[PDB]
A paper describes a structure:
When five-fold symmetry was imposed, the resolution of local reconstructions for the portal vertex in B-, C- and virion-capsids was improved to 4.05, 4.50 and 5.36 Å, respectively, albeit that the portal was five-fold averaged. A comparison of asymmetric reconstructions of the portal vertex of the three capsids reveals notable differences in the position and morphology of the portal and PVAT.
Here we show asymmetric reconstructions of herpes simplex virus 2 (HSV-2) B- (containing scaffold proteins inside, putative capsid assembly intermediate), C- (DNA-filled capsid, derived from the enveloped virion by using detergent treatment to remove viral membrane proteins and outer tegument proteins) and virion-capsids (enveloped intact virion) at 8.1, 9.0 and 10.2 Å respectively. Radially colored representations of the three reconstructions reveal the dodecameric portal situated beneath one of the pentameric vertices; but, the density surrounding the portal displays a five-fold symmetrical assembly, highlighting the symmetry-mismatch structural features. The portal vertex of the capsid is a hub for protein-protein interactions that are important for capsid assembly and genome packaging.
Author numbering:
A (entry chain K): 106 to 168, 176 to 215, 220 to 353, 416 to 441, 445 to 466
B (entry chain J): 5 to 165, 168 to 252, 258 to 318
C (entry chain I): 5 to 166, 174 to 230, 235 to 262, 267 to 318
D (entry chain B): 6 to 50
E (entry chain E): 198 to 208, 212 to 342
F (entry chain F): 100 to 345, 360 to 589
G (entry chain E): 394 to 442
H (entry chain F): 1032 to 1374
Amino acid sequence: PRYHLTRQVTLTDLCQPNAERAGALLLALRHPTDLPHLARHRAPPGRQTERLAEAWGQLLEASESGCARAGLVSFNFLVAACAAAYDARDAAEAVRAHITTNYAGARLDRFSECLRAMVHTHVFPHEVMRFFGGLVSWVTQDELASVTAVCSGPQEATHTGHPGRPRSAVTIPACAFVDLDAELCLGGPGAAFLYLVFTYRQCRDQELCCVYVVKSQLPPRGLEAALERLFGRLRITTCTYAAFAELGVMPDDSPRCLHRTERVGVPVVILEGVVWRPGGWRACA
Amino acid sequence: CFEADIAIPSGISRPDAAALQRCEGRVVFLPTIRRQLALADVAHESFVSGGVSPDTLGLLLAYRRRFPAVITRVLPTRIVACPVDLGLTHAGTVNLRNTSPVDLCNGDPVSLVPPVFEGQATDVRLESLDLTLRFPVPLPTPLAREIVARLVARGIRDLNPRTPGELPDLNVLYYNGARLSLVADVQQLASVNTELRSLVLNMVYSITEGTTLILTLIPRLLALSAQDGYVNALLQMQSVTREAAQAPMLMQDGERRLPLYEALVAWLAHAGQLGDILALAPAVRVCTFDGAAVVQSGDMAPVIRYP
Amino acid sequence: CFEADIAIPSGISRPDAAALQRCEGRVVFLPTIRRQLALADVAHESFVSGGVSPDTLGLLLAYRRRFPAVITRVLPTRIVACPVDLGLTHAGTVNLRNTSPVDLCNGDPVSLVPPVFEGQATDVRLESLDLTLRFPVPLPTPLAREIVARLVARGIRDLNPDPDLNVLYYNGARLSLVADVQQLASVNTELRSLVLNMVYSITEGTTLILTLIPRLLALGYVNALLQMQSVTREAAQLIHPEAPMLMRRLPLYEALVAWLAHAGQLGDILALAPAVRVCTFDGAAVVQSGDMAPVIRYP
Amino acid sequence: RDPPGYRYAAAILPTGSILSTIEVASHRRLFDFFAAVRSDENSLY
Amino acid sequence: LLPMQRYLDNGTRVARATLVAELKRSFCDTSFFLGKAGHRREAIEAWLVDLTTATQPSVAVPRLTHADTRGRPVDGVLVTTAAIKQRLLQSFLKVEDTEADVPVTYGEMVLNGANLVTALVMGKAVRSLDDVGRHLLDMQEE
Amino acid sequence: HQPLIARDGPHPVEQPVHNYMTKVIDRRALNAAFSLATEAIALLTGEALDGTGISLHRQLRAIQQLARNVQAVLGAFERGTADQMLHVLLEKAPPLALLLPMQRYLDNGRLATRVARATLVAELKRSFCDTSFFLGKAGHRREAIEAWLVDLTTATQPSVAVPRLTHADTRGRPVDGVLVTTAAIKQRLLQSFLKVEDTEADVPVTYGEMVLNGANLVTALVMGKAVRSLDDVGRHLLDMQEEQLETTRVRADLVAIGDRLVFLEALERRIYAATNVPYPLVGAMDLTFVLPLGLFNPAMERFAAHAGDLVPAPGHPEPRAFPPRQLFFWGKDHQVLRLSMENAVGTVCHPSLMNIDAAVGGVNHDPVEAANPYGAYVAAPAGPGADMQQRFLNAWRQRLAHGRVRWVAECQMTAEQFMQPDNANLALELHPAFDFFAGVADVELPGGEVPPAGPGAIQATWRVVNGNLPLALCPV
Amino acid sequence: LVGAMDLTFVLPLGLFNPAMERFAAHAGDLVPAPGHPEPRAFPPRQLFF
Amino acid sequence: SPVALYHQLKTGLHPGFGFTVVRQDRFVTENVLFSERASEAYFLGQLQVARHETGGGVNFTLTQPRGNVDLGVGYTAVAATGTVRNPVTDMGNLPQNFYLGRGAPPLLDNAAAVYLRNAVVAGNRLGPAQPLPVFGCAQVPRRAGMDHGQDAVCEFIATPVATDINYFRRPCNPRGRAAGGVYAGDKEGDVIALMYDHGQSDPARPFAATANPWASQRFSYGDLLYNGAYHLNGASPVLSPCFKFFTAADITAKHRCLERLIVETGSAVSTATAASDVQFKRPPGCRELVEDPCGLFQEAYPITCASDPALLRSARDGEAHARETHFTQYLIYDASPLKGLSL
Amino acid sequence: FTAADITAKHRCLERLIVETGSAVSTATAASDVQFKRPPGCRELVEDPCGLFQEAYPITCASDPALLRSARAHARETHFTQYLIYDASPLKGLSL
């Protein structure tokens, strides 16, 4: 009834919502204790199936099940994680400077080795880490993080956007100029859809990752017309690159911005007025 | 709902105001998400691309990247519409007007089709401002997927006209009886080619390394249609599979890779969802509160969200 | 919530009064959304359509047809159940009853068919009025779409016999799918309906394009772009199927329509669309089997 | 096209009550203006 | 009429056909029904009560008090081509209750007052607007 | 407590029962609704008004519309109780000529001898076939319809209750019968049968419909509307006047049958005028009709009934002695029709004629021993051809005479094979295209010289022709 | 009220009976004198009304 | 063979065996009800104004839970059913088609499979659509115009030709044997062997075992086509009148008490529906209250049909001079509740 | 025999009978042999054949010998001859 709330107790090895902002696209970490088994299948046996067991085993070594299963990869954490991956330098080192000063970069290097290894053994980081919400509060202890991070569609950014104007409320930072690929260059006035897009390419730049957002007044069923375009990475030859899940709707087209204010100079985008229509992933070819 | 107002521009002829009075519950294709819009961007002149108007395949191609909305209220200066793709978040259950020869059901998923029958023209005329409004035809999703497959193969007949000039129709549809006639007029090349490419593309990705294991079981089916009644109706009379029998090849990479299990999901992901790539996506589900089990041709149906 | 009231029939036995109490939180498929509903309309005998009790094919048609409903409160002479598909998105939090997988903090459960597990499990049968309630199984979408392709693969090995497919390890779960003693004789005979579709529409799908592409690309942009993607991937298996098997436009074009509708139905029959979502608050977010989970409306 | 609607302030003081009650669609092809509401409508006001 | 009026009560494509198949069987059998079966008396007393009950009595007009015959009011016409009227009563229904009735004179309807303005200054000239305007101005003030 | 009669005789002192009868309530809902638009919610509540007289008068139409809906739907329960009573009378209404033999059986004591059960039924089916549709079948017969109403009335027992409020007379007699009839019969029935005292003298005002339902329904939604509360609260004084559209006694019809004063009144013009609900006392009857096609006339019944009639012209061969392939009958008109076995090609030429895989495996439970298998076994040919008959008469000589071989059941005639004696082989005749018979279990059809004595199994053979189905089922 | 009424009538010329209905109603009816051709076997060409 | 039977019947050679023909008609009848003084007590309850919101304004619902009771120690309120308005059915001549049913194991020879299938269905009213679809129904394609009404469907049971015609002209069964549980004798082993044993005698014909050897026995093509378990029809939508007979479970455990059985006769549920063009078996949401006497006594009434038209003219206006038989041509006079009536 | 006459007729049985009170005949009463209607003429005949689109038999027969028994007890058929009994609203009438 245009109001909902979430709350989950996780650890501070990942996102660490103290150094993060009030606006944070918290993704999950779906099933860490999984993938010795499905990493073995869903791939040819000439893919070295023990790789996600070891590289994530190094990532858990970089810091048992505990009283909190490993969750909450931020959207901050992924920008540095593919910073060497997408073809953009000096705009990607700033967010990595935001993490190695305020979040240990060993947790980045073990994770980027997993990002190559996830696409190596064909078990992609999508259908992993579903969207979680918008981080209203962080009541975090020394080891824990009990974040109220409301899911459930349109109201989650309006309940953090109606009282936003006074002081500092959510504002939902896109957190990179290279990310938030704001589409409709050939565009006019209308309410746009937000998506969460992961592009892929097998053995070109060695199972490459790119983590960013697109903004379009295009349907998710017509987005594949544009997602098949706009890329040079159509030359795998197997398949299933360019996954996307709908982040929802931006019903204020003028409200996209360009700024550089965070924490370390981190280039950023204010996104005023968001529907968080949570959607699902869509990856076939 | 995100109520979208469509401005009724200039004058209005006294029957042209009544033209909008009978359209409460039809479907507006609007090529944006607006809170304010003028009427000419909706009309069939706005469907017209560079130079030509689209044919019955290109209309779906126009309808694909154009967002459906339903007329909810009728005012002489505005037409308050509700965008189904977004604003279907209702405890209000926006109604739909059946404009078809077809009783749907209570609960069938409903998608939209252009006017493609001989008597269901539905193109209204406005003498004040010369606009045509071909309203789409809300139809059940087994019926719509049975329509679109007819036009595609007829367009492939328009590619290569070998045999002499006595072809079968692909102009005859049956739905609970009811020999329905389509409109077979003109087939535009690009509207064929864009629809032809996706069908050939999607069926190639439906064959994986473990797919040819299923091809081994072709004489297994023909033994079953000789001694089972369910199989006999399943292998139809005009089937190419019955003509096909007129092959394991182990070659096992690793010998544990789940060879069937990848061939099913990939077939389910690629050639299974042919109804989403040829036609529009289903979003309309018939939800009758008072206990009506059917929705007659010309009646109203309260509508809830995705199937 | 517009909670539609299912009417209990007239007086039942005292164990039948206690049995319907422990169904508080199961999934119920109501055909119409009248505020007064009988209980025989709810029961599995109302799913009898072709003069037979249906298989998992006939259930998935019926489950893709009528409207889901979670039992809210069980009352004397009444069942108060609010349906899922009415209401706006993410309103009306209510409880599901878990079944053996975990159902984490999100995951979008699917009310999918009861015979995916042991055959006469959860079949609440009232001895008094003599009906049957077969409650469906609420599993999440990647665990839904995996298993429903996993069981149809197993029937192929039984359809013509000579690795065990049924492992499917989850995050904490070693999913024992095999009920070998008496259920695999009864679960395999119920996918007899669903397998023969899945075999046919593949073999009608592959063998159509195996005689389409030799008869096409021979009379423009179709030839350029499609072969641009299938450079020695599908062409490698084109020479493989045409040689290690057998090889008329008008039978083919009349078979083009017939497969595509039938292949189109399996996209709605299978693939298990997310009905509802889990999104928890003030909760431990990792749900035990047999524990109530807060569950909200739209994907 | 149509006659100028029905006038709802007229027949708030009705000059005569109809002496016979039937289903009205039994002579649907008889009338010139016709509107069959469902227990209330928006155009009544 | 008599089948067609019967299905208008509680009234279906078969009900269309079982109407029409049963419509023509009556018309082939019950027509010219004073010439046919006119010798016997019972079928014509049934025939007259088929005329007088088939119709619908509908509109209450007391503006003409056509109530006649010491108080028992008239509700029919039966214009009946007098060579038949000689034969109807003298055997079947010689029930002449009286030979005298009570009709009325014309009531007239003239643009007396406000209707002369509304027909001219406006277009519309709604009947008895002297009384309807009185009834509309009596309701809202309470 | 049931009426008892003190009984004499040498019988055991019969078992005395004096108990409390328990009964089963039903719950029925009687749902009713009324819409209310997107106007009259902004109106009636103060939410959309002004000081203008028209905005005060836009309210009044929507005020009067609730005067017209609420009086209808609260009237609808009174219109609905009479709909419910005619069902729950017809739910327990056993049709007559299934109660006239039934009560005369129970105007005996009751007879558990099972013969008088059977003499009930074979006469229960007879009284129905005679007088089901009695009026119209015997409509012109006066004094049989007089005898019909007196059987319609008195056959029911007055159920044991005092309703404490007696429907009176205008002369003297309390009223007990109801006699609900349709409107087309009552016109035919009042015109002949008097029809005394046309006024019900009493129908008292007990709590019967309600006094508070007119007040509860307007009040329960008032706080639900919560600002249209005082709209309908101030309405009800002026509601009844403007919606008029400018113990006690009720005029009802009375007849007396024998000595029973009943309320003979037809509905459907009062409570079912234009409600589109069917009148519940019009009730479909489903019969089934046997029209035996293509059969053959029995032996003594092939006469002419006179020597020359139905005679062709002398150049023509007199067809009628050919076996009759046709069947002619009237339809839903005059309309002679035609069945004519060429129309039966959609039944038997369908290839479900040849399925006995459900039969021969099914019938094979409790197998008979292989009794005298003379015509059932096939030997392989062996030895020289010259004496193959000879050792067949040397070897088989025991079991060939051990019993009567089955396939001379020839001396059975018409209506001898259809009966139990000498026809154990009745239950081995099952299919028109198949001769079922007992045979060996595991021995193949060919082979051998003398069949090994094994457990017999009932098996099938395909009938090659039509001529070789037996002569008692296809006479000479 | 004295008015007309139009009707259309259908009469068969020259048709022939079906195979079952070419009987005589009795053996000894409608025979001519014993030198005469029995014209009732002839296919009809006429009608009488 | 059912290809050789195709050439005999369409040409006109009698195949050495005869048919009995069962056909279910539906007559809309008047009623006269009676009742006694206190026939049924009646309860009231309360009103429970329940609201709902739709497209537009609010929608209120009112429903009052209420109760009745029997209150009768003896029988009360008979319902004499005396007049007929119209037969809804045409009363004949629609041949039952088994090609709508897919439960039949077909022929092996695939040339013979499709030649036999289309040579029947060149023009049948009961012919399916193009194929049978696996999901849906074959719809039995509607004709554009219809006159008499709902077409009653004639089902055919093979019989020997040497059954006595005296078995008919009488309300007898089609299965050559009495079968109902009204006839039963309370052994608790009764209607398994009343219906399927053939050492004992027919009840209706006590002097013979069964008048019809094919239809009466278990597993015997009057059983195999039309029993409820084997379902060669049951995917087909067309009403099977012989499902009223021939069915195992319905004639079994369902009900036994004759004193209870007659109040549940005039309230019974039809297999057909009258709203359908061709009569179909009942869709799951439908209730047609039908008297239906043949469901109780387990019988079927013969109507007048004679194999000549020459006999058929004679059995007009009375059976006084009805030409009841003539050399091979047999006449049956109407034995039904509709005897002595117009239709 | 005329498609345009049948197709131009509306199908509602509410109104089809009220032009079966008065329909315009295609025949006039004035001319000696019945003429097709001169186009400005409104005759208002009752016209029952136009509704059902059905026509009627009257008493006719091919023998006069059959016809003499047409005054039920009629000799209804004979060697190749035939009779048709009256089936019309004129049955049971003199003229």
